[PDB]
Amino acid sequence: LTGTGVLTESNKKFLPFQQFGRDIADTTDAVRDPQTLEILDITPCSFGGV
Amino acid sequence: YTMSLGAENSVAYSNNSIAIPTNFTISVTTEILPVSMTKTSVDCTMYICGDSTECSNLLLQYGSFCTQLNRALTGIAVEQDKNTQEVFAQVKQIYKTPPIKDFGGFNFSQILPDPSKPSKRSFIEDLLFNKVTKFNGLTVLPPLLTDEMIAQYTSALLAGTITSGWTFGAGAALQIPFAMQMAYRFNGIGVTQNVLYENQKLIANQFNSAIGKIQDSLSSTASALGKLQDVVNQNAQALNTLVKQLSSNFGAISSVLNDILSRLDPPEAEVQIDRLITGRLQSLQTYVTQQLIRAAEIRASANLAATKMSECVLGQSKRVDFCGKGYHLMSFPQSAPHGVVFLHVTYVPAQEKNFTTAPAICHDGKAHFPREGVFVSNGTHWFVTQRNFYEPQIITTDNTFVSGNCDVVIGIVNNTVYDP
Amino acid sequence: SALGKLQDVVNQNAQALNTLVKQLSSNFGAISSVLNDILSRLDPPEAEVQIDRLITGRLQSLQTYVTQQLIRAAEIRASANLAATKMSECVLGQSKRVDFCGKGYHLMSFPQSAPHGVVFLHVTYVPAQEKNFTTAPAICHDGKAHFPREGVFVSNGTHWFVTQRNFYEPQIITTDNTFVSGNCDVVIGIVNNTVYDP
Amino acid sequence: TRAGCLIGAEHVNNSYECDIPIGAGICASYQTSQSIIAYTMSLGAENSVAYSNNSIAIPTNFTISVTTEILPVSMTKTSVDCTMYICG
Numbered sequence: 232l233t234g235t236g237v238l239t240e241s242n243k244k245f246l247p248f249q250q251f252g253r254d255i256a257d258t259t260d261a262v263r264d265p266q267t268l269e270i271l272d273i274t275p276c277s278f279g280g281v
Numbered sequence: 282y283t284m285s286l287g288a289e290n291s292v293a294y295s296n297n298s299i300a301i302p303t304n305f306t307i308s309v310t311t312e313i314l315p316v317s318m319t320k321t322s323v324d325c326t327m328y329i330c331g332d333s334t335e336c337s338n339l340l341l342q343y344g345s346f347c348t349q350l351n352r353a354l355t356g357i358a359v360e361q362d363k364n365t366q367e368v369f370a371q372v373k374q375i376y377k378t379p380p381i382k383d384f385g386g387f388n389f390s391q392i393l394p395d396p397s398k399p400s401k402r403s404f405i406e407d408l409l410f411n412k413v414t415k416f417n418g419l420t421v422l423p424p425l426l427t428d429e430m431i432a433q434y435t436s437a438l439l440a441g442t443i444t445s446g447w448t449f450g451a452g453a454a455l456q457i458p459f460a461m462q463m464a465y466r467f468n469g470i471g472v473t474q475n476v477l478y479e480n481q482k483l484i485a486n487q488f489n490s491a492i493g494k495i496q497d498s499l500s501s502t503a504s505a506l507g508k509l510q511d512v513v514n515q516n517a518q519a520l521n522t523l524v525k526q527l528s529s530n531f532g533a534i535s536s537v538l539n540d541i542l543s544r545l546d547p548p549e550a551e552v553q554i555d556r557l558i559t560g561r562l563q564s565l566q567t568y569v570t571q572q573l574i575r576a577a578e579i580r581a582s583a584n585l586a587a588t589k590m591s592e593c594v595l596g597q598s599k600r601v602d603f604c605g606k607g608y609h610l611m612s613f614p615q616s617a618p619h620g621v622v623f624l625h626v627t628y629v630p631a632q633e634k635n636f637t638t639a640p641a642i643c644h645d646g647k648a649h650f651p652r653e654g655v656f657v658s659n660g661t662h663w664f665v666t667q668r669n670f671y672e673p674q675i676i677t678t679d680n681t682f683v684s685g686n687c688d689v690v691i692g693i694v695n696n697t698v699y700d701p
Numbered sequence: 702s703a704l705g706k707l708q709d710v711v712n713q714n715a716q717a718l719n720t721l722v723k724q725l726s727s728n729f730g731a732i733s734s735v736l737n738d739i740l741s742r743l744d745p746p747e748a749e750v751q752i753d754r755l756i757t758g759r760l761q762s763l764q765t766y767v768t769q770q771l772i773r774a775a776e777i778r779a780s781a782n783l784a785a786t787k788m789s790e791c792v793l794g795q796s797k798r799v800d801f802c803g804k805g806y807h808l809m810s811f812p813q814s815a816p817h818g819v820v821f822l823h824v825t826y827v828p829a830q831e832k833n834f835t836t837a838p839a840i841c842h843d844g845k846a847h848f849p850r851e852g853v854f855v856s857n858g859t860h861w862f863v864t865q866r867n868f869y870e871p872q873i874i875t876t877d878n879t880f881v882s883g884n885c886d887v888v889i890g891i892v893n894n895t896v897y898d899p
Numbered sequence: 900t901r902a903g904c905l906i907g908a909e910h911v912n913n914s915y916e917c918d919i920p921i922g923a924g925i926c927a928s929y930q931t932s933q934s935i936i937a938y939t940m941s942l943g944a945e946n947s948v949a950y951s952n953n954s955i956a957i958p959t960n961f962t963i964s965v966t967t968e969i970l971p972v973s974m975t976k977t978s979v980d981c982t983m984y985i986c987g
């Protein structure tokens with residue numbers, strides 16, 4: 232599962248069988264790391280107009 | 282069921298009967314208008330392609346479509362500040378109230394700003410604010426004026442209205458006692474000023490009561506501010522739709538640009554990308570068109586709001602239903618999220634009695650007409666009185682004027698006129 | 702910059718039209734934006750493919766243009782309706798609408814023409830020197846409460862006068878200036894003075 | 900600021916009429932040695948009205964003002980041929 236972004240530790244709980252989560256827009260919100268079974272949140276990299 | 286259009290009312294019309302109010306009430310009503318909407322902005326390239334180089338290059342085949350869409354949205358966002366500025370920023374100075382709130386019994390403490398809060402809003406304004414209530418190239422620009430700044434303009438308009446009447450809206454603010462200001466407003470609706478002074482306590486009490494009713498109405502009924510909530514909901518829905526469209530395949534193997542890119546070589550990847558571009562571009566164009574139409578609707582509302590501020594708050598209107606129902610006396614603005622709320626104070630006749638009337642009285646062959654008011658009778662004696670409030674007076678030569686004689690006016694009454 | 706509103710209308714339409722023209726140079730996936738390059742080089746079974754994609758692109762560009770002009774046209778019409786209203790209420794009469802015909806009290810207006818628009822010159826009256834006077838809602842004389850028919854009662858610190866509200870012009874208070882209703886015990890803040898009877 | 904990161908303008912804590920708007924209460928202008936500055940905009944001068952229960956202000960003079968209001972009425976009557984534009 233790929234993408235570009237900033238990873239932080241999450242403070243949410245996944246059920247034991249869930250592998251990743253999604254937001255209201257149905258995009259990837261968070262993932263379960265495959266080696267350490269911890270949940271990380273994915274934040275888009277900052278951007279804006281100039 | 283078949284709906285009713287209202288109760289029936291047979292008016293007791295006759296060629297010699299007039300009904301005249303002997304009492305009145307003061308009513309304060311609330312009118313709510315949208316002024317602006319969220320200044321959103323959408324990046325025409327990021328929405329469609331993200332950070333994909335291949336997609337970005339394919340979009341060059343469409344020329345200026347990308348920039349036209351951003352230009353249109355930018356224009357809307359600018360207009361939203363223009364609308365706000367026109368409605369509220371129309372006072373030349375920021376006026377303040379005196380430290381001693383002596384307004385002749387009229388209590389404005391619920392509409393004046395509260396000095397103890399971090400945001401100087403009135404009690405009513407706090408109620409209004411409490412009741413009204415994805416990253417793919419989509420952003421929101423802040424408004425130029427902040428809520429605190431709007432509150433200051435509102436406060437200035439209110440302070441002006443209370444201490445200098447409408448004068449500040451034409452020239453310099455010139456102080457006037459509040460009760461005298463009301464006297465002018467009463468003459469302005471056809472009611473002689475002595476009516477105000479002789480009933481000053483009553484009028485002030487009815488006013489104060491009406492404000493308390495407003496606080497309860499707004500506190501208990503969330504739906505009261507539905508017009509502003511509606512603007513918010515429609516823009517939110519349009520935007521969520523734009524986002525959901527990114528998940529459509531439009532004939533593609535996948536809606537995800539990265540799934541196409543990570544699996545196919547360019548000679549094939551481009552086919553899949555091109556169809557996603559067409560679909561996403563069409564979806565974005567649809568969004569922008571709808572926002573232009575919606576923006577126009579809001580602007581029209583803002584223009585109306587600006588007009589009401591000028592004609593209802595900065596003066597006394599003669600337009601019949603323009604500044605609330607009843608005869609207009611004065612109005613006070615309050616701010617609201619993305620809009621303005623007006624409190625309109627009107628005079629309503631409220632107890633009528635059946636009097637006999639006549640168009641004229643003939644005395645010694647001369648036809649006498651009232652200068653002001655009408656002639657009435659209680660069944661024994663004839664009096665002259667002002668039209669909007671029963672107050673009978675002896676008919677004298679200082680009340681009437683003479684033109685013509687007993688043989689011209691239809692329905693002329695045989696009586697005398699007193700000469701002091 | 703004084704006439705920026707009219708210049709703005711011109712600039713927006715010019716920009717929209719230039720955009721429509723520039724779009725003719727886009728390929729939209731075609732080998733060439735020039736219809737004649739396609740026709741002079743390819744046999745019909747192939748030329749049609751290239752032509753069809755140019756048509757789709759050009760048709761979409763034109764539809765976009767027309768939609769924008771319909772929206773813009775509506776904005777102008779609304780302005781024209783306002784202008785027509787002002788001609789009727791500011792030029793052909795004297796308006797009572799507070800900020801409708803300029804700031805200050807309206808006296809009269811005069812139209813002037815302009816490219817694609819109208820310019821109004823609004824003549825208004827503005828009060829311009831105030832002074833601080835003492836006032837009262839009424840004067841009681843021999844138990845009778847006297848109110849002005851027009852104007853207000855004022856005092857210069859020693860004498861009371863009645864004057865028109867919008868321009869200081871003090872007059873002796875007489876029975877021809879005031880009317881009587883009620884007495885000294887009803888009006889709040891009523892002043893103790895006399896009224897002259899000619 | 901709340902409107903973004905502003906680089907090159909000098910922020911001051913004075914208050915001035917708005918010239919070039921930035922957002923969220925902030926504007927910028929070029930002034931006195933002349934450089935771009937950023938500031939909170941002023942909403943106007945303050946005016947404490949001398950209100951009392953017995954004082955009225957009355958003008959003793961007036962002026963005549965003439966102001967200009969400009970409104971658009973029409974736009975160029977363009978026309979586009981739906982076939983020629985596309986096909987020549």
Ligand SMILES: *[C@@H]1O[C@H](CO)[C@@H](O[C@@H]2O[C@H](CO)[C@@H](O)[C@H](O)[C@H]2NC(C)=O)[C@H](O)[C@H]1NC(C)=O
Binds near residue numbers: 388390391
């Ligand atoms: C104006 O009305 C407000 C209520 O809307 C009055 O507020 C009350 O003030 C007293 C103190 O004098 C408090 O004990 C009450 O609890 C307050 N009432 C509420 C609902 O908070 C205010 O006194 C009135 N002002 C004048 C001059 O009459």
Ligand SMILES: *[C@@H]1O[C@H](CO)[C@@H](O[C@@H]2O[C@H](CO)[C@@H](O)[C@H](O)[C@H]2NC(C)=O)[C@H](O)[C@H]1NC(C)=O
Binds near residue numbers: 303
């Ligand atoms: C005009 O109507 C008002 C009410 O709108 C009358 O005032 C009320 O009188 C009753 C007694 O009959 C009191 O209990 C209420 O408290 C009064 N209300 C207020 C706000 O003061 C008034 O008396 C009527 N006047 C005439 C001449 O009929």
Ligand SMILES: *[C@@H]1O[C@H](CO)[C@@H](O[C@@H]2O[C@H](CO)[C@@H](O)[C@H](O)[C@H]2NC(C)=O)[C@H](O)[C@H]1NC(C)=O
Binds near residue numbers: 643644645646687695
């Ligand atoms: C109206 O008042 C007049 C007196 O001012 C009454 O007196 C006269 O009546 C006779 C008979 O009808 C008329 O010919 C005279 O012309 C009247 N005098 C004048 C000055 O008009 C008259 O009767 C009264 N009319 C009614 C209907 O009561």
Ligand SMILES: *[C@@H]1O[C@H](CO)[C@@H](O[C@@H]2O[C@H](CO)[C@@H](O)[C@H](O)[C@H]2NC(C)=O)[C@H](O)[C@H]1NC(C)=O
Binds near residue numbers: 659660662
């Ligand atoms: C019409 O109004 C008059 C007063 O203007 C009433 O007459 C008065 O009645 C009182 C007793 O209630 C007497 O003390 C006064 O002297 C009478 N005045 C006059 C001029 O006669 C008259 O009764 C009323 N008529 C009707 C039908 O209401």
Ligand SMILES: *[C@@H]1O[C@H](CO)[C@@H](O[C@@H]2O[C@H](CO)[C@@H](O)[C@H](O)[C@H]2NC(C)=O)[C@H](O)[C@H]1NC(C)=O
Binds near residue numbers: 842893
């Ligand atoms: C207002 O003017 C009256 C005279 O018109 C003064 O004269 C009387 O004063 C006594 C004592 O206060 C009262 O009981 C009388 O009722 C007054 N006469 C009348 C006709 O009202 C009165 O003193 C003056 N009041 C003030 C405050 O100067």
Ligand SMILES: *[C@@H]1O[C@H](CO)[C@@H](O[C@@H]2O[C@H](CO)[C@@H](O)[C@H](O)[C@H]2NC(C)=O)[C@H](O)[C@H]1NC(C)=O
Binds near residue numbers: 857858859860
């Ligand atoms: C208030 O106005 C009156 C005039 O209406 C001023 O009194 C006059 O003063 C002149 C001298 O400047 C005398 O010649 C007149 O005879 C006075 N008239 C009267 C009726 O006394 C009065 O001084 C003004 N008061 C103030 C405080 O300015």
Ligand SMILES: *[C@@H]1O[C@H](CO)[C@@H](O)[C@H](O)[C@H]1NC(C)=O
Binds near residue numbers: 265266267268
């Ligand atoms: C993967 O291997 C590392 C290193 O031996 C170990 O620390 C980790 O717990 C292992 N994770 C899983 C899911 O087996």
Ligand SMILES: *[C@@H]1O[C@H](CO)[C@@H](O)[C@H](O)[C@H]1NC(C)=O
Binds near residue numbers: 293300635
């Ligand atoms: C006037 O009289 C009619 C009967 O002729 C009655 O129905 C009506 O209610 C009366 N109106 C008032 C104000 O008393």
Ligand SMILES: *[C@@H]1O[C@H](CO)[C@@H](O)[C@H](O)[C@H]1NC(C)=O
Binds near residue numbers: 296297691692693
């Ligand atoms: C009013 O109507 C009655 C109906 O019976 C009629 O007799 C009377 O002459 C009329 N009066 C006037 C002034 O029209």
Ligand SMILES: *[C@@H]1O[C@H](CO)[C@@H](O)[C@H](O)[C@H]1NC(C)=O
Binds near residue numbers: 956
């Ligand atoms: C009225 O008096 C106040 C002081 O109480 C003063 O500040 C104000 O400028 C005066 N107004 C005029 C018109 O002289």
Ligand SMILES: *[C@@H]1O[C@H](CO)[C@@H](O)[C@H](O)[C@H]1NC(C)=O
Binds near residue numbers: 889952953
């Ligand atoms: C005006 O206010 C003063 C405040 O000291 C008070 O003494 C006076 O009685 C008030 N007069 C009126 C008519 O309200």
Ligand SMILES: *[C@@H]1O[C@H](CO)[C@@H](O)[C@H](O)[C@H]1NC(C)=O
Binds near residue numbers: 910911912913
């Ligand atoms: C801010 O205000 C202080 C006075 O309180 C003044 O000394 C200082 O120079 C001002 N600074 C700026 C950047 O405006």
